[PDB]
């Protein structure tokens, strides 16, 4: 390797004539005390106001706990409701004002996605971002969650993620989210392209392009090394809990009744994140099959994408990679889910 401190090796060149199998082991050695970038993405609905109340305790209670696990801690903030076209929101003017005046809370126009605070180590800027924050809403119950998760993922110089950091994305909601083909009720039929579209920290394709699919979302969370934690309050925790097999590398935590465990939710999910090491291969060459086997430090032999749990640091998880060839006619990259460094395998 000689560059990567976590995955070794970093570059192996394999020459194959077909009908022959090659074989190598790749060690994953976790670090202790990563730098951590935690970006909150909060549902701005009126039901979420006790939860934005409890975001006040982030700079006091959470940042003290995360010093015992991390070496840096930078906080960001974002806000989503839903796409701002009908039938999602109400396009009638005084129905909005009746709807704002009902909640006896400060309200603002609903929005697709507004990036509020970049990643910073000032907790007094996080407390500015919370007390400035107001309420919005749509009419139907699902929200524009996955649409804002992709904009908080691909926009790197706007969110301000660090390459050399453990990137966490706490999604914070209580309803479900719209899917890629809910958009046809609004006549939104051009598919989500997957590029960054923040003009002035406001997502400006929120009424033209559609919601992402789960495959569109998951390929952007893994390419951008972003670890997603869902903090879901009501009965829809079980919805996001059942999408976790479709979204590899996502953790789901249930906010309790009085939201008393928000600071515990980030601590416990960050513990489960460095404890689990699994891999996946991006194969863009034809005629080449990979076959990766996970050897746990427990000794239990699991598949490669299943990975090994209960991993601490000073453990070196081994992935016995076997590659074959079927026919003749470029490189493949085998990377662990949630790490900044990859492994480049030339053919």
């Amino acid at each position: 390797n000689e560059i990567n401190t976590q995955v070794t090796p970093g570059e192996v060149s394999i020459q194959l004539r077909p009908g022959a199998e090659a074989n190598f082991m790749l060690k994953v050695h976790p670090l202790k005390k990563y730098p951590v970038d935690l970006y909150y993405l909060v549902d701005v609905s009126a039901s979420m106001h006790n939860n934005i109340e409890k975001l006040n305790s982030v700079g006091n209670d959470l940042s003290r706990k995360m010093a015992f696990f991390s070496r840096d801690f930078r906080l960001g903030f974002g806000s989503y409701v839903d796409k701002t076209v009908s039938p999602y929101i109400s396009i009638h003017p005084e129905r909005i004002h009746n709807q704002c005046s009902d909640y006896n809370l400060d309200c603002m126009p609903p929005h697709g996605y507004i990036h509020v605070l970049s990643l910073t180590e000032n907790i007094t800027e996080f407390e500015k971002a919370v007390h400035r924050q107001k309420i919005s809403g749509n009419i139907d119950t699902p929200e524009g969650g996955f649409d804002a998760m992709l904009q908080a993922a691909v926009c790197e110089s706007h969110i301000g993620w660090r390459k050399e950091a453990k990137r966490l994305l706490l999604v914070m909601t209580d309803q479900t989210s719209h899917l890629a083909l809910d958009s046809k009720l609004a006549g939104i039929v051009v598919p989500n392209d997957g590029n960054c579209h923040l003009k002035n920290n406001v997502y400006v394709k929120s009424t033209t392009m559609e919601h992402p699919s789960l495959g569109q979302l998951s390929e952007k969370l893994i390419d951008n090394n972003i670890n997603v934690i869902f903090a879901v309050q009501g009965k829809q925790f079980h919805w996001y809990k059942d999408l976790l097999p479709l979204l590899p590398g996502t953790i789901a935590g249930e906010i309790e009744s009085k939201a008393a465990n928000l600071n515990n939710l980030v601590v416990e999910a960050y513990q489960k994140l460095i404890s689990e090491v699994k891999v996946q291969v991006e194969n863009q060459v034809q005629g080449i099959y990979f076959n990766i086997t996970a050897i746990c430090p427990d000794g239990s032999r699991k598949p490669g994408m299943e990975g090994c749990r209960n991993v601490t640091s000073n453990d070196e998880v081994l992935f016995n990679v076997t590659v074959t060839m079927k026919k003749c006619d470029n490189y493949a990259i085998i990377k662990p889910i949630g790490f900044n460094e990859t492994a480049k395998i030339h053919i």
């Epitope: 109340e53 006040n56 400060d106 407390e127 007390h131 107001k134």
Partner: antibody, heavy 119, light 104 residues
């Protein structure tokens, strides 16, 4: 209900300071913030600042910036405001206003305190 | 800074009549406006929250309407105790601001 009780009336020469009290009582649920507002004699109400009780987080007015400081006492639930570098144009009656989180309207006010300045 | 301009400055009426008090804004506050009553010698007392909701314990001649920029406060039968100075209060953004008041 919530009774906000302040300190007594004050008088203080220019270039000094004054520390007014506002003891929250009644129903305190820790999600509130105590404001202060200035009513100069024969002029409208004037926003000075905000102090959230959960964090100790402050929000100030830019006209008053560098002259106003708000601290608190947790066990007695008494929140303090300290104006410094007083001038003769700061002569007014000071109220303390209580919110709850998210709704920045002034639900409770209490009595006033009268600050006089010159000589 | 959201400047709240309130008109008229003073408003001389008779007991039993109906009074209207306008209040404009510098930008859109979407029913983020509250109304206060201040008798002389007392603290301001909130009358209407979020431009149309009635505070409990207040006699329902005080009813407001408006949104965005231009909001109003309407007294049905101008009782003799209603004569005070009335204030607007923007709650849309920091700094919190007031209007200058309308004597009555």
């Amino acid at each position: 209900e919530v009774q906000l009780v302040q300190s007594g009336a004050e008088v203080k020469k220019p270039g000094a300071s004054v520390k007014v009290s506002c003891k929250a009582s009644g129903y305190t649920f820790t999600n509130y913030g105590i404001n202060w507002v200035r009513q100069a004699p024969g002029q409208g109400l004037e926003w000075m600042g905000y102090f959230y009780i959960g964090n100790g987080y402050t929000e100030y007015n830019e006209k008053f910036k560098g002259r106003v400081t708000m601290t608190s006492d947790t066990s007695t639930s008494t929140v303090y405001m300290e104006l410094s570098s007083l001038r003769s144009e700061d002569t007014a009656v000071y109220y303390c206003a209580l919110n709850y989180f998210g709704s920045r309207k002034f639900d409770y006010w209490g009595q006033g305190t009268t600050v006089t300045v010159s000589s | 800074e959201i400047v709240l301009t309130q008109s008229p400055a003073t408003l001389s009426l008779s007991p039993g009549e109906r009074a209207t008090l306008s209040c404009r804004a510098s930008q859109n506050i979407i029913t983020n406006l509250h109304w206060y009553q201040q008798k002389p010698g007392q603290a301001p007392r909130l009358l209407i929250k979020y431009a149309s909701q009635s505070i409990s314990g207040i006699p329902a001649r005080f009813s407001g309407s408006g949104s965005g920029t231009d909001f109003t406060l309407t007294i049905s039968s101008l009782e003799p105790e209603d004569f005070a100075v009335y204030f607007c209060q923007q709650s849309d953004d920091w700094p919190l601001t007031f209007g200058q008041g309308t004597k009555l």
